[PDB]
Design a protein around this nucleic acid. Structure first.
Ligand SMILES: [Mg+2]
Ligand SMILES: [Mg+2]
Ligand SMILES: [Mg+2]
Ligand SMILES: [Mg+2]
Ligand SMILES: [Mg+2]
Ligand SMILES: [Mg+2]
Ligand SMILES: [Mg+2]
Ligand SMILES: [Mg+2]
Ligand SMILES: [Mg+2]
Ligand SMILES: [Mg+2]
Ligand SMILES: [Mg+2]
Ligand SMILES: [Mg+2]
Ligand SMILES: [Mg+2]
Ligand SMILES: [Mg+2]
Ligand SMILES: [Mg+2]
Ligand SMILES: [Mg+2]
Ligand SMILES: [Mg+2]
Ligand SMILES: [Mg+2]
Ligand SMILES: [Mg+2]
Lengths: 117, 48, 103, 142, 109
RNA sequence: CUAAAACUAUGUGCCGAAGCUGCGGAUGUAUACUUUGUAUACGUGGUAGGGGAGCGUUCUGUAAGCCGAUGAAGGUGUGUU
RNA sequence: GGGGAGUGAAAUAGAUCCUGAAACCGCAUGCAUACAAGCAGUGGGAGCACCUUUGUGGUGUGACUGCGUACCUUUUGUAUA
């Protein structure tokens, strides 16, 4: 039962090289280099699934800060005031309202201010 | 139910042989259960 | 008409006719669900903010179906330690369409 | 729904003039850099230049506290075997006030193509007069 | 419609012939013939042979007019090498590859 | 950076991890009743190493069967599980 | 050496002649690229081009941006120069 390694080996190399399209030089042509390139890409993607949620929350907090400082507060005091008024809108929606609807955001800032005083 | 097509052995009577040196996912890959760098890691390694 | 609703542990800002994906639901494809824990309603210089809920506000939606997102590949590796591991993932979702917002 | 980025084609930069007579240098530089980057706008996007233009006038009337007018050193290297060059704050302010704001503000910005493109919107003049009267700047009381 | 001519097995390397092929790509047939006529390069002779053959094929088998023709396509490919041995100093031996090319011309209006 | 953007003392907020909570999914062990089906609970970072379960490859029987010139194996793309 | 003609079911079956992979080397089209510093990806993300529908679609490219020093072996310990 002599077994030849021609078809399965060729298909494995082919599948690894099909996942390396767009890479530069030997990284999309040479199996040894493309294999390390695909593994490192998977590692990077695993770590950036975690980092994406931090980056987006930082962006929401910055936009809410910009919106609150036009209404007379800092981010800290608006978030504290909204928590003291039992408003539970999260930051993803607050940043949306800051970026698209200035009147409703002024209403929210007034509610927070009233809660603080 | 009686054909050369339809005869199976009892459950738990056959096992696959253990195969060393066939990749990472097997658990018996690189060194094949022998450790690192001793007399017992050599070929014909046991002492009398 | 811009209401704010809760679903699947997250919050959404919806209008009428909008189609959106949320986490998997137990409801049946073709049924009708109703969100009656509404957080804010804006109808144009008329703004109802819930503390934490707007009292008599309703949002109705229809279940179009259930599906899976595209495949994600998880790869764990430890360099110089003889350790590699791989996995696949597809996440489930329910597709809703917004029918009415009461206010 | 999702978080949208600002489109560069929809961005609108505005023009402001700020007077520097009798002002601490770094406490002005932080405000200038914050306006140059666009952090005061609710459409702020870290990969988009949504900032504003700033004009500084009377750049030779800016101040430092303590003993820094005589003791703060500015350095340069020409990349020749002994080409380190040294100057003062007070020698450099009566002779090149544009470079003091250049350094103070550029140190407070990102370091890459978008940071190079933001510093272009700062215009520093030693005297009371600027040439950009056609752009209609506003008086920003920083 | 393009009319083809092939010159397979030219005894020159493709890198040397590509320089002359870059000079006449996309030009009128008479201008390219002039360029090839007044060249001091060795690849110019082979490229002129292939171009003359393509013009003759276009006018004989396809019956086209010549003042309207153009060098629409031209490219050079590699052929098979000849392996030889060169004795070096102190008993060492080097391998010499003698290279070949294929010229392809396509003439069209 | 100088009545600080330093130091000491006090207070009120906020930011901040793959920690914890929320929502969806998989899996190990043990238990409870059907009597094999789900709940409940605790767990699920890993080198050397031990245990368990699988995919694919060539060949023999099943096979004088089944598919194939209305196009097999092989090669090259696309879609999907 | 080729282009017609002709044979043949087939001539990128034409004698280096079944099938004809990869490394390597050209020609053509689309997009990007000559003020910007590093394992070349990854998470975002504008614009353009081509398909298509009256799209919160598909395909190619990727300005700008956060993070980020290959693999194996041997070691107390390696981006390791
Ligand atoms: Mg192990
Ligand atoms: Mg060893
Ligand atoms: Mg040892
Ligand atoms: Mg040992
Ligand atoms: Mg000799
Ligand atoms: Mg907090
Ligand atoms: Mg977190
Ligand atoms: Mg956890
Ligand atoms: Mg859970
Ligand atoms: Mg484990
Ligand atoms: Mg754990
Ligand atoms: Mg063929
Ligand atoms: Mg052949
Ligand atoms: Mg440029
Ligand atoms: Mg460089
Ligand atoms: Mg050593
Ligand atoms: Mg040592
Ligand atoms: Mg290290
Ligand atoms: Mg080196």
């Amino acid at each position: 039962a002599r077994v030849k390694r021609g078809v399965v080996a060729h298909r494995r190399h082919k599948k690894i090289l099909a996942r390396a399209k767009g890479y530069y030089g030997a990284r999309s042509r040479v199996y040894r280099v493309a294999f390390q390139a695909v593994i490192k890409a998977g590692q990077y993607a695993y770590r950036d699934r975690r980092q994406k949620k931090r980056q987006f929350r930082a962006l929401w907090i910055a936009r809410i800060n910009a919106g609150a400082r036009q209404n007379g507060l800092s981010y800290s005091r608006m978030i504290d005031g909204l928590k003291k008024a039992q408003v539970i809108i999260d930051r993803r929606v607050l940043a949306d309202i800051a970026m698209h609807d200035a009147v409703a955001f002024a209403a929210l800032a007034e509610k927070a201010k009233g809660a603080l005083a | 139910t009686l054909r050369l097509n339809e005869l199976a052995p009892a459950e738990g009577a056959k096992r696959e042989h253990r195969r060393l040196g066939r990749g990472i996912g097997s658990g018996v890959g690189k060194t094949g259960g022998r450790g690192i760098k001793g007399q017992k890691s050599r070929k014909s390694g046991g002492v009398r | 008409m811009y209401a704010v609703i809760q679903s699947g542990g997250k919050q959404h800002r919806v209008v009428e006719g909008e189609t959106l994906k949320v986490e998997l639901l137990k409801a049946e494809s073709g049924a009708t669900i109703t969100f009656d824990d509404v957080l804010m309603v804006v109808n144009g210089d008329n703004i109802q903010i819930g503390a934490p809920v707007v009292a008599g506000a309703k949002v109705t939606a229809e279940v179009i179906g259930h599906g899976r997102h595209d495949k994600i590949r998880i790869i764990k590796m430890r360099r110089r330690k003889h350790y590699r591991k791989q996995q696949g993932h597809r996440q489930w979702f329910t597709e809703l369409k917004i029918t009415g917002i009461s206010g | 729904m999702k978080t949208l980025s600002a489109k560069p084609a929809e961005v609108q930069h505005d023009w402001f003039v700020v007077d520097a007579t009798g002002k601490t240098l770094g406490r002005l530089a932080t405000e200038i850099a914050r306006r140059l980057r666009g952090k005061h706008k609710t459409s702020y996007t870290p990969h988009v230049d949504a900032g504003d233009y700033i004009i500084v006038i009377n750049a030779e009337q800016v101040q430092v506290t303590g003993n820094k007018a005589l003791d703060k050193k500015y350095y340069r290297h020409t990349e020749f075997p002994g080409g380190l060059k040294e100057t003062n704050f007070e020698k450099l302010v009566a002779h090149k006030p544009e470079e003091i704001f250049e350094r103070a503000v550029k140190g407070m910005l990102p370091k890459g193509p978008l940071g190079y493109a933001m510093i272009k919107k700062m215009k520093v003049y030693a005297g009371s007069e600027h040439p950009h009267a056609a752009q209609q700047p506003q008086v920003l009381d920083i | 419609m393009e009319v083809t001519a092939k010159l397979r097995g030219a005894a020159i390397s493709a890198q040397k012939a590509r320089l002359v092929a870059d000079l006449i790509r996309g030009k009128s047939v008479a201008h390219a013939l002039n360029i090839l006529n007044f060249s001091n390069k060795k690849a110019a002779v082979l490229v002129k042979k292939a171009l003359e053959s393509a013009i003759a094929n276009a006018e004989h088998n396809n019956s086209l007019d010549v003042d309207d023709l153009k060098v629409s396509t031209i490219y050079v490919d590699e052929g098979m090498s000849l392996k030889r041995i060169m004795p070096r100093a102190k008993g060492r031996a080097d391998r010499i590859t003698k290279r070949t090319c294929h010229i392809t011309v396509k003439v069209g209006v």
